[PDB]
Design a protein around this ligand. Structure first.
Ligand SMILES: [Cl-]
Ligand SMILES: [Cl-]
Ligand SMILES: [Cl-]
Ligand SMILES: [Cl-]
Ligand SMILES: [Cl-]
Ligand SMILES: [Cl-]
Ligand SMILES: [Cl-]
Ligand SMILES: [Cl-]
Ligand SMILES: [Cl-]
Ligand SMILES: [Mg+2]
Ligand SMILES: [Mg+2]
Ligand SMILES: [Mg+2]
Lengths: 337, 337, 337
């Protein structure tokens, strides 16, 4: 332990431990499985692994509930940098391994999300739980890509959850700089595993993809994230037509050319639990965003399947559904059928 | 252990203050918000942590200075090692005290990120000054948010003393340093446009000459100068020869921009803590005062502390040193017409 | 102890503690001593200081064995970043001081090697024992250069042991970027001590110098490293001619214009102790690499005079020679006489 020269080199996840499972890949503007069928990610976020462990809720039964009773085919894991450091990489990766085995057994997929909020080029963030560096972010993806080489269960590497400069208080937002840094991460990933799908985000908290109309990331096999929460678009008159136009302008257009995953979406009533901008809505957003995504073939993972973090999909750890939880549960179950 | 419950930060309560004029930049001068030309005239005190450690961080210190030494400004040299040691939350809690004390006395603060070295390569004169670009940005992000709309906090002195120590710390490069200052100013102005950023040149904040051809391309800023006695080295020591050399390296700036000499002072060559560049027989005192008075230059003498040299006081009963007695009389006279 | 303002400024090695010793310098494509005679470094690596200390093998008797019985005029010290942090700079430098005194007393020289493996520009590495940052690497060279100013015993500063991107998994290898960074380090070093010899490495684990044909480091007085282990070149037919041609193309050509030190080389049988790519050979490599270097006037330090780290030169701490150890011992003893 004091003999640092005898610390072992890292090992890769044992692919023989898994049951057969299709790889998902990008083909044009769609995801497809390795049988050639169009595939749509449909599922939920759960909380950070460390948060779940802290209350003894990191267990296979959580994934079983979701796969069997909520219609999901995907779970997004929002890996918070502060938690990565607190558990440490070795321990955190040991718990991701569990998630891989649990998901594989149920035939569902994982999105691994490096869950920071802020501006990576200046290393300034919305809150210290998101604090990271370029060096730590690169090392996270280097470790992940090596460990989960050739693992179909781990489908998407979501490089940096929510880019934002908070009105340029964190730095001067610059698309060219952000594009170049994403390309750099993708190059490190693809040097280690070409079968994984990188997921890239725009500014305004992963809401604004409009820069990619003329400056998309110059790499193959990638998809784009979107976080179309209810109050991100602000039409004077609230109806389907006006939201659809604003969504089209900022993010929806991307689905015409590339696959898109709405890796966060959801709402709570303005006087409901943990209500805050931009997630406040009277509920009309639910049918509206689902209709929009269904029309464009957009994939999604609702935020969040947790009783503490808001907007919640459940009210307690017996999985009593919240308003949005009841709504999306029915949507996902119907889509699965 | 629940990192997700760590609170978001709060802003200083502007209602806690009595009415106080804002200071702003207009052309080559500072003005108050009544439109009258304003000159910062005061002293440095030691780092907050040093003062706390000996029970000298107290309102009575500010009272002594305002009532008995003629000051209208105190410069707080916030040393990065001390920022880390107390931690941001605690250190900011103490800056809050200084704000309330200064406001009650009608005096102003210069907040100085007190490092010595070359930020672009993150190499420094001594570990007490050790920082990074990331930490420096974060300091200014936190400060600007917390003291938004606070008139008492007048000046944000971005980086005390740039130097490469004969290029041992890096290759001095004005373009690179200019760009980094512009980056910090942008972050600050995104959060509070009413504050005055203060920018320094090389040779330990002595050499402003690069701004003749390449000034910082932002409005509402001022430039620092640290014209210690031995920075200029004329063969023949007299007013004329020092004035010429001063003019060439820093004084010329005051023709176009406001300048604050945020450090100046001397001790006898055989006096307490004597070191280059602060050694002088005393003829410097009248000389630098005459020079600044002719150019309208603002200043804060280094240092109102009995341990750090050159001292203005010999003990915590405020027994004046040689330079202390001299500047005390100058400031008292300037305060009354 | 809590008073950070009283932490001392650093001191320099006391040159009066040394006996008279020639300085080595660069002249054209050769090293010369300060008598003007062509000089060739010929010796060995030993293990990291912390590893040796841990087993009570950091002792003058080690250097005595090598100088008196193995024909060496040089020892390379591979200072591992993790060990630098574990001992701490002050303590590690105190032990380098011992090595300086021991080497000086024996009339031999030291190569100080910042022993990392990976890609410094992205701060990604082969293993955590090598983990560093640009900031830490600069600080290492800043401290070293100041401390060993005007010390002839310390001849070479090997800036970064083994540049590699491990098939671009660590970053996109880019010569211009790496060149520029080495130039930056050299400038900081030369600002502090112009008498030292910087040693610069290429990609593919310090094997590929070919980028210097067009784009050499644009500074005077430097030498280039090479690590020509047996399996770095892979000719279909294994003989002198074919290895010489491949070696010429990738690194040997450099010796026509600049001095070269092969700061690692060696082999073990493919079924021998700690055998791994690229150090496996049947033994024919020994005479071959020696003949090649002798023809080109190339300097060298064999890896490694340690019984634990492979390929070993000794089987135990009584200095029983391994196969390669017996071979190089005879070569060095003959070259010395
Ligand atoms: Cl499905
Ligand atoms: Cl933004
Ligand atoms: Cl709100
Ligand atoms: Cl300088
Ligand atoms: Cl001195
Ligand atoms: Cl006044
Ligand atoms: Cl010799
Ligand atoms: Cl390489
Ligand atoms: Cl091997
Ligand atoms: Mg995979
Ligand atoms: Mg203010
Ligand atoms: Mg030397």
């Amino acid at each position: 332990s004091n003999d640092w020269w005898d610390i072992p080199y890292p090992s890769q996840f044992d692919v023989k431990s898994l049951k057969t499972q299709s790889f998902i890949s990008v083909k044009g503007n769609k995801f497809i499985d390795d049988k050639g069928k169009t595939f749509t990610f449909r599922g939920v976020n759960i909380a950070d692994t460390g948060k779940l462990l802290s209350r003894n809720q990191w267990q296979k039964s959580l994934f079983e509930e979701l796969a069997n009773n909520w219609g999901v085919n995907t779970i997004r894991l929002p890996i918070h940098p502060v938690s990565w450091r607190k558990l440490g990489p070795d321990v955190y990766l040991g718990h991701i391994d569990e998630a891989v085995r649990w998901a594989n057994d149920l035939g569902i997929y994982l999105i691994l999300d490096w869950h920071s909020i802020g501006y990576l080029p200046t290393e300034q963030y919305q809150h210290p739980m998101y604090d990271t560096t370029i060096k730590e972010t690169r090392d996270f993806w280097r470790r992940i890509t090596f460990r989960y080489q050739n693992v179909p269960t781990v489908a998407v590497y979501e490089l940096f959850n929510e880019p934002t400069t908070m009105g340029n208080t964190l730095g001067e937002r610059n698309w060219a700089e952000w594009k170049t840094l994403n390309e750099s991460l993708i190059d490190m990933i693809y040097a280690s595993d070409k079968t994984v799908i990188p997921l890239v985000a725009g500014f305004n908290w992963a809401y604004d993809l409009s820069p990619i109309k003329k400056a998309p990331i110059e790499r193959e096999g990638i998809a784009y994230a979107a976080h179309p929460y209810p109050q991100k678009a602000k039409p004077e008159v609230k109806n389907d037509k006006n939201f659809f136009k604003l969504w089209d302008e900022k993010w929806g257009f991307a689905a015409d050319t590339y696959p898109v995953i709405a890796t966060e979406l959801g709402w709570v009533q303005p006087d409901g639990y943990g209500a805050h901008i931009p997630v406040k809505d009277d509920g009309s957003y639910g049918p509206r965003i689902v209709k929009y995504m269904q029309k464009k073939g957009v994939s999604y993972t609702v935020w969040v399947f947790d009783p503490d973090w808001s907007p919640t999909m459940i009210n307690d750890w017996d999985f009593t559904p919240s308003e949005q939880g009841a709504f999306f549960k029915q949507v996902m179950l119907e889509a699965k059928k």
